[PDB]
Amino acid sequence: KETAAAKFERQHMDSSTSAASSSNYCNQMMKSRNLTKDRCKPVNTFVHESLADVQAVCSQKNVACKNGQTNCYQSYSTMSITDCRETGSSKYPNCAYKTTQANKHIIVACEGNPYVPVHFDASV
């Protein structure tokens, strides 16, 4: 099966663009990354940075995750992110999202060896 690390890349990484360029970014990306296959995932965040810079966050500031776990890490720097949130007209299989572009610190949970991001916790 797909590894947790691979799933994080699929769900959260977009190193191919620097920022969302149009209001349709989330509709396109949620569909193309197969996040709407079974149901409309209600919220998702894409990170517009190199995979290496995001993996490096697992060696930065240790913080508690929202759910209390202590394998979360906050990035020292802000990063380019896109927030995707389901709209009121969203109806499976035609899932619909609002695109919001922002520059925030990210918080990820890390696991494994190599120690890599496997869950996106929050942006602050």
Side-chain angles (χ1 to χ4, degrees), residues 10-97:
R10 182 172 54 85
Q11 293 196 133
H12 299 297
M13 290 300 309
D14 183 12
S15 312
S16 295
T17 64
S18 298
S21 55
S22 82
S23 64
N24 273 313
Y25 174 90
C26 285
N27 291 337
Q28 288 168 344
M29 291 291 292
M30 294 294 287
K31 176 177 180 54
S32 66
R33 296 293 184 87
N34 293 321
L35 308 179
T36 60
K37 182 185 163 281
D38 291 307
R39 68 183 183 104
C40 306
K41 185 178 181 199
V43 191
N44 191 54
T45 300
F46 292 99
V47 183
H48 304 275
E49 301 295 345
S50 72
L51 180 58
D53 284 347
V54 174
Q55 289 166 338
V57 174
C58 297
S59 67
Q60 294 179 16
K61 181 56 170 179
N62 188 210
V63 297
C65 313
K66 282 181 180 164
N67 80 332
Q69 289 174 207
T70 51
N71 64 319
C72 275
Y73 295 84
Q74 184 180 302
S75 64
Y76 294 135
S77 317
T78 58
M79 293 187 174
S80 173
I81 66 167
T82 302
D83 277 325
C84 303
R85 184 155 292 95
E86 196 176 19
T87 68
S89 297
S90 183
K91 186 178 195 299
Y92 185 87
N94 303 125
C95 305
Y97 296 89

Coordinates of all heavy atoms in Angstrom, one line a residue, residues 10-97:
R10 N 1.5 13.3 -1.8 CA 0.3 13.4 -2.7 C -0.7 14.4 -2.2 O -1.3 15.1 -3.0 CB -0.3 12.0 -2.9 CG -1.5 11.9 -3.8 CD -2.0 10.5 -4.1 NE -2.3 9.7 -2.9 CZ -3.5 9.8 -2.2 NH1 -4.5 10.6 -2.6 NH2 -3.6 9.0 -1.2
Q11 N -1.0 14.4 -0.9 CA -2.0 15.2 -0.4 C -1.6 16.6 -0.2 O -2.4 17.5 -0.2 CB -2.5 14.6 0.9 CG -3.3 13.3 0.8 CD -4.1 13.0 2.0 OE1 -5.3 12.5 1.9 NE2 -3.5 13.1 3.2
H12 N -0.3 16.9 0.0 CA 0.1 18.2 0.5 C 1.2 18.9 -0.2 O 1.4 20.1 0.1 CB 0.5 18.1 2.0 CG -0.6 17.6 2.9 ND1 -1.8 18.3 3.1 CD2 -0.7 16.5 3.6 CE1 -2.6 17.6 3.9 NE2 -2.0 16.5 4.2
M13 N 1.9 18.3 -1.1 CA 3.0 19.0 -1.8 C 2.7 19.4 -3.1 O 2.2 18.7 -4.0 CB 4.2 18.0 -1.8 CG 4.8 17.8 -0.4 SD 5.4 19.2 0.5 CE 6.5 20.0 -0.7
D14 N 3.0 20.7 -3.5 CA 3.0 21.1 -4.9 C 4.2 22.1 -5.1 O 4.1 23.3 -5.0 CB 1.7 21.9 -5.2 CG 1.6 22.3 -6.6 OD1 2.5 21.8 -7.4 OD2 0.7 23.1 -7.0
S15 N 5.3 21.4 -5.4 CA 6.6 22.1 -5.6 C 6.6 22.7 -7.0 O 7.5 23.4 -7.4 CB 7.8 21.2 -5.4 OG 7.7 20.4 -4.2
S16 N 5.6 22.4 -7.8 CA 5.6 22.8 -9.2 C 5.1 24.2 -9.5 O 5.2 24.7 -10.6 CB 4.8 21.8 -10.1 OG 5.4 20.5 -10.1
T17 N 4.4 24.8 -8.5 CA 3.9 26.1 -8.6 C 4.3 26.9 -7.3 O 4.5 26.3 -6.3 CB 2.4 26.2 -8.7 OG1 1.8 25.6 -7.5 CG2 1.9 25.4 -9.9
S18 N 4.5 28.2 -7.4 CA 4.9 29.0 -6.3 C 3.8 29.5 -5.4 O 3.9 29.8 -4.3 CB 5.7 30.2 -6.8 OG 6.8 29.8 -7.5
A19 N 2.6 29.5 -6.0 CA 1.4 29.9 -5.3 C 0.2 29.5 -6.2 O 0.4 29.1 -7.4 CB 1.4 31.5 -5.2
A20 N -1.0 29.5 -5.6 CA -2.2 29.3 -6.5 C -2.4 30.5 -7.4 O -2.3 31.6 -6.9 CB -3.4 29.1 -5.6
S21 N -2.7 30.2 -8.6 CA -2.8 31.3 -9.6 C -4.2 31.7 -10.1 O -4.4 32.6 -10.8 CB -2.0 30.9 -10.9 OG -2.5 29.7 -11.4
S22 N -5.2 30.9 -9.6 CA -6.6 31.2 -10.0 C -7.5 30.5 -8.9 O -7.1 29.7 -8.2 CB -6.9 30.7 -11.4 OG -7.2 29.3 -11.4
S23 N -8.7 31.0 -8.9 CA -9.7 30.5 -8.0 C -10.0 29.0 -8.2 O -10.6 28.4 -7.4 CB -11.0 31.3 -8.1 OG -11.6 31.2 -9.3
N24 N -9.6 28.4 -9.4 CA -9.9 27.0 -9.7 C -8.8 26.1 -9.2 O -8.9 24.9 -9.4 CB -10.2 26.8 -11.1 CG -11.6 27.0 -11.5 OD1 -12.5 26.5 -10.8 ND2 -11.9 27.8 -12.5
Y25 N -7.8 26.6 -8.6 CA -6.6 25.8 -8.2 C -7.0 24.6 -7.3 O -6.7 23.4 -7.6 CB -5.6 26.6 -7.5 CG -4.4 25.8 -6.9 CD1 -3.2 25.6 -7.7 CD2 -4.5 25.3 -5.6 CE1 -2.2 24.8 -7.1 CE2 -3.4 24.5 -5.1 CZ -2.3 24.3 -5.9 OH -1.3 23.6 -5.3
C26 N -7.8 24.8 -6.3 CA -8.2 23.8 -5.4 C -9.1 22.8 -6.1 O -8.9 21.6 -5.9 CB -8.9 24.3 -4.2 SG -7.8 25.1 -3.0
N27 N -10.1 23.2 -6.9 CA -10.9 22.3 -7.6 C -10.1 21.3 -8.4 O -10.4 20.1 -8.5 CB -12.0 23.0 -8.5 CG -13.0 23.7 -7.7 OD1 -13.3 23.4 -6.5 ND2 -13.6 24.7 -8.3
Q28 N -9.1 21.9 -9.1 CA -8.3 21.0 -10.0 C -7.4 20.1 -9.2 O -7.3 18.9 -9.5 CB -7.4 22.0 -10.9 CG -8.2 22.7 -12.0 CD -7.4 23.8 -12.7 OE1 -6.4 24.3 -12.1 NE2 -7.9 24.2 -13.8
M29 N -6.7 20.6 -8.2 CA -5.8 19.8 -7.4 C -6.4 18.8 -6.5 O -5.9 17.7 -6.4 CB -4.9 20.7 -6.6 CG -4.0 21.6 -7.4 SD -2.7 20.7 -8.2 CE -1.7 20.2 -6.8
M30 N -7.5 19.1 -5.9 CA -8.2 18.1 -5.1 C -8.6 16.9 -5.9 O -8.5 15.8 -5.5 CB -9.4 18.7 -4.4 CG -9.0 19.8 -3.3 SD -8.1 19.2 -1.9 CE -9.4 18.3 -1.0
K31 N -9.0 17.2 -7.1 CA -9.5 16.1 -8.0 C -8.2 15.3 -8.6 O -8.2 14.1 -8.5 CB -10.3 16.7 -9.2 CG -10.6 15.6 -10.2 CD -11.5 16.2 -11.4 CE -11.9 15.1 -12.4 NZ -12.5 13.9 -11.7
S32 N -7.2 16.0 -9.0 CA -6.1 15.4 -9.7 C -5.2 14.6 -8.7 O -4.6 13.6 -9.2 CB -5.2 16.4 -10.4 OG -4.5 17.3 -9.6
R33 N -5.2 14.9 -7.4 CA -4.5 14.2 -6.5 C -5.3 13.1 -5.8 O -4.8 12.4 -4.9 CB -3.9 15.1 -5.4 CG -2.9 16.1 -5.9 CD -1.6 15.4 -6.4 NE -0.6 16.4 -6.8 CZ 0.2 17.0 -6.0 NH1 0.3 16.8 -4.8 NH2 1.1 17.9 -6.5
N34 N -6.5 12.9 -6.3 CA -7.4 11.8 -5.9 C -7.9 11.9 -4.5 O -8.2 10.9 -3.9 CB -6.7 10.4 -6.2 CG -6.4 10.1 -7.6 OD1 -7.3 10.4 -8.4 ND2 -5.3 9.6 -8.0
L35 N -8.1 13.1 -4.1 CA -8.6 13.4 -2.7 C -10.1 13.4 -2.7 O -10.7 13.5 -1.6 CB -8.0 14.7 -2.2 CG -6.5 14.8 -2.3 CD1 -5.9 16.1 -1.8 CD2 -5.8 13.6 -1.6
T36 N -10.7 13.4 -3.8 CA -12.2 13.4 -3.9 C -12.8 12.0 -4.4 O -13.9 12.0 -4.8 CB -12.7 14.5 -4.8 OG1 -12.1 14.4 -6.1 CG2 -12.2 15.9 -4.2
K37 N -11.9 11.0 -4.5 CA -12.3 9.7 -5.1 C -13.5 9.1 -4.4 O -14.5 8.7 -5.1 CB -11.1 8.8 -5.1 CG -11.3 7.4 -5.7 CD -10.1 6.5 -5.5 CE -10.5 5.1 -5.8 NZ -11.2 4.4 -4.7
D38 N -13.5 9.0 -3.1 CA -14.5 8.3 -2.3 C -15.5 9.3 -1.7 O -16.6 8.9 -1.4 CB -13.8 7.5 -1.2 CG -13.0 6.3 -1.7 OD1 -13.6 5.6 -2.5 OD2 -11.8 6.2 -1.4
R39 N -15.1 10.5 -1.4 CA -15.9 11.5 -0.7 C -15.2 12.8 -0.9 O -14.0 12.9 -1.3 CB -16.1 11.2 0.8 CG -14.8 11.4 1.5 CD -14.9 11.0 3.0 NE -13.6 11.3 3.7 CZ -13.4 12.4 4.5 NH1 -14.3 13.2 4.8 NH2 -12.2 12.5 5.0
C40 N -15.9 14.0 -0.7 CA -15.3 15.3 -0.8 C -14.5 15.5 0.5 O -15.2 15.7 1.6 CB -16.3 16.4 -1.0 SG -17.3 16.2 -2.4
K41 N -13.2 15.4 0.5 CA -12.5 15.8 1.7 C -12.8 17.3 2.0 O -12.6 18.1 1.1 CB -11.0 15.5 1.5 CG -10.1 15.8 2.7 CD -8.6 15.4 2.4 CE -7.8 15.7 3.7 NZ -6.3 15.8 3.5
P42 N -13.1 17.7 3.2 CA -13.6 19.0 3.4 C -12.6 20.1 3.5 O -12.9 21.3 3.1 CB -14.3 18.9 4.8 CG -13.7 17.7 5.5 CD -13.5 16.8 4.4
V43 N -11.4 19.8 3.9 CA -10.3 20.8 4.0 C -9.0 20.1 3.6 O -8.8 19.0 3.9 CB -10.2 21.3 5.5 CG1 -9.2 22.5 5.6 CG2 -11.5 21.6 6.1
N44 N -8.1 20.9 3.0 CA -6.8 20.4 2.7 C -5.9 21.6 2.4 O -6.3 22.6 2.0 CB -6.8 19.4 1.5 CG -5.6 18.7 1.3 OD1 -5.1 18.0 2.2 ND2 -4.9 18.8 0.2
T45 N -4.6 21.4 2.7 CA -3.6 22.4 2.5 C -2.5 21.9 1.6 O -2.0 20.8 1.8 CB -3.0 22.9 3.8 OG1 -4.0 23.4 4.7 CG2 -1.9 23.9 3.6
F46 N -2.1 22.7 0.6 CA -1.0 22.4 -0.3 C 0.2 23.3 0.0 O -0.1 24.5 0.3 CB -1.4 22.5 -1.8 CG -2.3 21.5 -2.2 CD1 -3.7 21.7 -2.3 CD2 -1.9 20.2 -2.6 CE1 -4.6 20.8 -2.7 CE2 -2.7 19.2 -3.0 CZ -4.1 19.5 -3.1
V47 N 1.4 22.8 0.0 CA 2.6 23.5 0.3 C 3.4 23.7 -0.9 O 3.7 22.7 -1.6 CB 3.4 22.8 1.4 CG1 4.6 23.7 1.8 CG2 2.5 22.6 2.6
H48 N 3.7 25.0 -1.3 CA 4.5 25.3 -2.5 C 5.9 25.6 -2.2 O 6.4 26.7 -2.3 CB 3.9 26.6 -3.1 CG 2.4 26.5 -3.4 ND1 1.9 25.9 -4.6 CD2 1.3 26.9 -2.7 CE1 0.6 26.0 -4.6 NE2 0.2 26.6 -3.5
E49 N 6.6 24.5 -1.7 CA 8.0 24.6 -1.4 C 8.7 23.3 -1.9 O 8.0 22.4 -2.2 CB 8.2 24.7 0.1 CG 7.5 25.9 0.8 CD 8.1 27.2 0.4 OE1 9.2 27.3 -0.2 OE2 7.5 28.3 0.6
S50 N 10.0 23.3 -1.9 CA 10.7 22.0 -2.2 C 10.4 20.9 -1.1 O 10.1 21.3 0.1 CB 12.2 22.2 -2.3 OG 12.8 22.4 -1.0
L51 N 10.3 19.7 -1.6 CA 10.1 18.6 -0.6 C 11.2 18.6 0.4 O 10.9 18.4 1.6 CB 10.1 17.3 -1.4 CG 9.9 16.0 -0.6 CD1 8.5 16.1 0.2 CD2 9.9 14.8 -1.5
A52 N 12.4 18.9 0.1 CA 13.5 18.9 1.1 C 13.3 19.9 2.2 O 13.6 19.7 3.4 CB 14.8 19.2 0.4
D53 N 12.8 21.1 1.8 CA 12.5 22.2 2.8 C 11.4 21.8 3.8 O 11.4 22.2 4.9 CB 12.2 23.5 2.2 CG 13.4 24.2 1.6 OD1 14.6 23.8 1.9 OD2 13.2 25.2 0.8
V54 N 10.4 21.0 3.3 CA 9.3 20.6 4.1 C 9.8 19.4 5.0 O 9.5 19.3 6.2 CB 8.1 20.2 3.3 CG1 7.0 19.6 4.1 CG2 7.6 21.4 2.6
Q55 N 10.6 18.4 4.4 CA 11.1 17.3 5.2 C 12.0 17.9 6.4 O 12.0 17.3 7.4 CB 11.9 16.4 4.3 CG 11.1 15.5 3.4 CD 12.0 14.9 2.3 OE1 13.1 15.3 2.0 NE2 11.4 13.8 1.8
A56 N 12.7 18.9 6.1 CA 13.6 19.5 7.1 C 12.8 20.0 8.4 O 13.4 20.2 9.4 CB 14.4 20.7 6.5
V57 N 11.5 20.3 8.2 CA 10.8 20.8 9.4 C 10.8 19.7 10.5 O 10.7 20.1 11.7 CB 9.3 21.1 8.9 CG1 8.4 21.6 10.1 CG2 9.4 22.2 7.9
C58 N 11.0 18.4 10.2 CA 11.1 17.4 11.2 C 12.3 17.5 12.2 O 12.4 16.8 13.2 CB 11.1 16.0 10.6 SG 9.6 15.6 9.7
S59 N 13.2 18.4 11.8 CA 14.3 18.8 12.7 C 14.3 20.2 13.2 O 15.3 20.7 13.7 CB 15.7 18.6 11.9 OG 15.8 19.5 10.8
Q60 N 13.1 20.8 13.2 CA 13.0 22.2 13.6 C 12.2 22.2 15.0 O 12.6 21.5 15.8 CB 12.3 23.0 12.5 CG 13.2 23.1 11.3 CD 12.8 23.9 10.1 OE1 11.8 24.6 10.1 NE2 13.5 23.6 9.1
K61 N 11.3 23.1 15.2 CA 10.8 23.3 16.6 C 9.7 22.3 16.9 O 8.6 22.3 16.4 CB 10.1 24.7 16.7 CG 9.6 25.1 18.0 CD 10.6 25.0 19.2 CE 9.9 25.7 20.5 NZ 10.8 25.6 21.7
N62 N 10.0 21.4 17.9 CA 9.1 20.4 18.4 C 8.0 21.1 19.2 O 8.2 21.9 20.1 CB 9.9 19.4 19.3 CG 9.1 18.2 19.8 OD1 9.4 17.7 20.9 ND2 8.1 17.7 19.0
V63 N 6.8 20.8 18.9 CA 5.6 21.3 19.5 C 4.5 20.2 19.6 O 4.6 19.2 18.9 CB 5.0 22.5 18.7 CG1 5.9 23.7 18.7 CG2 4.6 22.1 17.3
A64 N 3.5 20.4 20.4 CA 2.4 19.5 20.5 C 1.5 19.7 19.3 O 1.2 20.8 18.9 CB 1.7 19.7 21.9
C65 N 1.1 18.6 18.8 CA 0.0 18.6 17.8 C -1.3 19.0 18.4 O -1.5 19.0 19.6 CB -0.1 17.2 17.2 SG 1.4 16.3 16.7
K66 N -2.3 19.3 17.5 CA -3.6 19.8 18.0 C -4.2 18.7 18.9 O -4.9 19.1 19.9 CB -4.5 20.1 16.9 CG -4.3 21.4 16.2 CD -5.3 21.6 15.1 CE -5.1 23.0 14.4 NZ -5.8 23.1 13.1
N67 N -4.0 17.4 18.6 CA -4.6 16.4 19.4 C -3.8 15.9 20.6 O -4.1 15.0 21.3 CB -4.8 15.2 18.5 CG -3.6 14.3 18.2 OD1 -2.4 14.8 18.3 ND2 -3.8 13.0 18.0
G68 N -2.7 16.6 20.9 CA -1.9 16.4 22.1 C -0.6 15.6 21.8 O 0.2 15.5 22.7
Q69 N -0.5 14.9 20.7 CA 0.7 14.1 20.4 C 1.9 15.1 20.4 O 1.8 16.2 20.1 CB 0.6 13.5 19.0 CG -0.3 12.3 18.9 CD -0.5 11.8 17.5 OE1 -1.5 11.2 17.1 NE2 0.6 11.9 16.6
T70 N 3.1 14.5 20.6 CA 4.3 15.3 20.7 C 5.3 15.1 19.7 O 6.5 15.4 19.8 CB 4.9 15.2 22.1 OG1 5.1 13.8 22.5 CG2 4.0 15.8 23.2
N71 N 4.9 14.5 18.5 CA 5.8 14.3 17.4 C 5.5 15.3 16.3 O 5.7 15.0 15.1 CB 5.7 12.9 16.8 CG 4.3 12.5 16.3 OD1 3.3 12.9 16.9 ND2 4.3 11.8 15.2
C72 N 5.0 16.5 16.7 CA 4.8 17.6 15.7 C 5.9 18.6 15.8 O 6.7 18.7 16.7 CB 3.5 18.3 16.0 SG 2.0 17.5 15.2
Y73 N 6.1 19.3 14.7 CA 7.2 20.2 14.4 C 6.7 21.4 13.6 O 5.9 21.2 12.7 CB 8.3 19.6 13.7 CG 9.0 18.5 14.5 CD1 8.4 17.2 14.5 CD2 10.1 18.7 15.3 CE1 9.0 16.2 15.2 CE2 10.6 17.7 16.1 CZ 10.0 16.5 16.0 OH 10.5 15.4 16.8
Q74 N 7.1 22.6 14.1 CA 6.7 23.8 13.5 C 7.9 24.4 12.7 O 9.0 24.4 13.2 CB 6.3 24.9 14.5 CG 5.8 26.2 14.0 CD 5.4 27.2 15.0 OE1 4.5 26.9 15.9 NE2 6.0 28.3 15.0
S75 N 7.6 24.9 11.5 CA 8.7 25.4 10.7 C 9.2 26.8 11.2 O 8.4 27.6 11.7 CB 8.2 25.6 9.2 OG 7.2 26.5 9.1
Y76 N 10.5 27.0 11.2 CA 11.0 28.3 11.6 C 10.6 29.4 10.7 O 10.3 30.5 11.2 CB 12.6 28.2 11.7 CG 13.2 27.3 12.7 CD1 14.2 26.5 12.3 CD2 12.7 27.3 14.0 CE1 14.8 25.6 13.3 CE2 13.3 26.4 14.9 CZ 14.3 25.6 14.6 OH 14.9 24.7 15.5
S77 N 10.6 29.1 9.4 CA 10.2 30.1 8.4 C 8.7 29.9 8.0 O 8.1 28.9 8.2 CB 11.0 29.9 7.2 OG 12.4 29.8 7.5
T78 N 8.1 31.0 7.4 CA 6.9 30.9 6.8 C 7.1 30.2 5.4 O 8.2 30.2 4.9 CB 6.2 32.3 6.6 OG1 7.1 33.1 5.8 CG2 5.9 33.0 7.9
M79 N 6.0 29.7 4.9 CA 6.0 29.0 3.7 C 4.8 29.4 2.9 O 3.8 29.8 3.4 CB 6.0 27.4 3.9 CG 7.3 26.9 4.5 SD 7.3 25.2 4.6 CE 9.0 25.0 5.2
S80 N 4.9 29.2 1.6 CA 3.8 29.5 0.7 C 2.8 28.3 0.7 O 3.2 27.2 0.4 CB 4.2 29.7 -0.7 OG 3.2 29.8 -1.6
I81 N 1.6 28.6 1.1 CA 0.5 27.5 1.2 C -0.7 28.0 0.5 O -1.1 29.1 0.4 CB 0.2 27.1 2.7 CG1 -0.4 28.3 3.4 CG2 1.5 26.6 3.3 CD1 -1.0 27.9 4.8
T82 N -1.5 27.0 0.2 CA -2.8 27.2 -0.3 C -3.8 26.3 0.5 O -3.6 25.1 0.6 CB -3.0 26.7 -1.8 OG1 -2.1 27.5 -2.6 CG2 -4.4 27.0 -2.3
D83 N -4.8 27.0 1.0 CA -5.9 26.4 1.8 C -7.0 26.1 0.9 O -7.4 27.0 0.1 CB -6.2 27.3 3.0 CG -5.3 27.1 4.2 OD1 -4.8 26.0 4.5 OD2 -5.0 28.1 4.9
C84 N -7.6 24.9 0.9 CA -8.7 24.5 0.2 C -9.8 24.1 1.1 O -9.7 23.2 2.0 CB -8.4 23.3 -0.7 SG -7.1 23.6 -1.9
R85 N -11.0 24.7 1.0 CA -12.1 24.5 1.9 C -13.4 24.3 1.1 O -13.6 25.0 0.1 CB -12.3 25.7 2.9 CG -13.4 25.5 3.9 CD -13.1 26.4 5.1 NE -11.9 25.9 5.9 CZ -10.7 26.4 5.7 NH1 -10.5 27.4 4.9 NH2 -9.7 25.9 6.5
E86 N -14.1 23.2 1.4 CA -15.3 22.9 0.6 C -16.3 24.1 0.7 O -16.5 24.7 1.7 CB -15.9 21.6 1.2 CG -16.9 21.0 0.3 CD -17.4 19.7 0.9 OE1 -17.3 19.4 2.1 OE2 -18.0 18.9 0.1
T87 N -17.0 24.4 -0.4 CA -18.0 25.4 -0.5 C -19.4 24.8 -0.3 O -19.6 23.6 -0.4 CB -18.0 26.2 -1.8 OG1 -18.5 25.3 -2.9 CG2 -16.7 26.7 -2.2
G88 N -20.3 25.7 -0.2 CA -21.7 25.3 0.0 C -22.3 24.6 -1.2 O -23.3 23.9 -1.0
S89 N -21.8 24.8 -2.4 CA -22.3 24.1 -3.5 C -21.7 22.8 -3.8 O -22.0 22.1 -4.8 CB -22.2 25.0 -4.8 OG -23.0 26.2 -4.6
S90 N -20.7 22.4 -3.0 CA -20.0 21.1 -3.2 C -21.0 20.0 -2.9 O -21.7 19.9 -1.9 CB -18.9 21.1 -2.2 OG -18.2 19.9 -2.4
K91 N -21.0 19.1 -3.9 CA -21.8 17.9 -3.8 C -21.2 16.7 -4.6 O -21.1 16.8 -5.8 CB -23.2 18.2 -4.3 CG -24.2 17.0 -4.2 CD -25.6 17.4 -4.7 CE -26.6 16.3 -4.2 NZ -26.3 15.0 -4.6
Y92 N -20.8 15.7 -3.9 CA -20.2 14.5 -4.4 C -21.0 14.0 -5.6 O -22.2 13.8 -5.4 CB -20.0 13.5 -3.4 CG -19.2 12.3 -3.8 CD1 -17.8 12.3 -3.8 CD2 -19.9 11.2 -4.4 CE1 -17.1 11.2 -4.3 CE2 -19.2 10.1 -4.9 CZ -17.8 10.1 -4.8 OH -17.1 9.0 -5.3
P93 N -20.3 13.7 -6.7 CA -18.9 13.6 -7.0 C -18.3 15.0 -7.5 O -17.1 15.0 -7.7 CB -18.7 12.6 -8.0 CG -20.0 12.7 -8.8 CD -21.1 13.2 -7.9
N94 N -19.1 16.0 -7.5 CA -18.7 17.3 -8.0 C -18.3 18.2 -6.8 O -19.0 19.1 -6.4 CB -19.8 18.0 -8.8 CG -20.2 17.1 -10.0 OD1 -21.4 16.8 -10.2 ND2 -19.2 16.7 -10.8
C95 N -17.2 17.9 -6.2 CA -16.7 18.5 -5.0 C -16.2 19.9 -5.5 O -15.5 20.0 -6.5 CB -15.6 17.7 -4.4 SG -16.0 16.0 -4.0
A96 N -16.4 20.9 -4.6 CA -16.1 22.2 -4.9 C -15.4 22.9 -3.8 O -15.9 22.8 -2.6 CB -17.3 23.0 -5.4
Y97 N -14.4 23.7 -4.1 CA -13.5 24.3 -3.1 C -13.3 25.8 -3.3 O -13.2 26.2 -4.4 CB -12.2 23.6 -3.0 CG -12.3 22.1 -2.6 CD1 -12.6 21.1 -3.5 CD2 -12.3 21.8 -1.3 CE1 -12.8 19.8 -3.1 CE2 -12.5 20.5 -0.9 CZ -12.7 19.5 -1.8 OH -12.9 18.2 -1.4

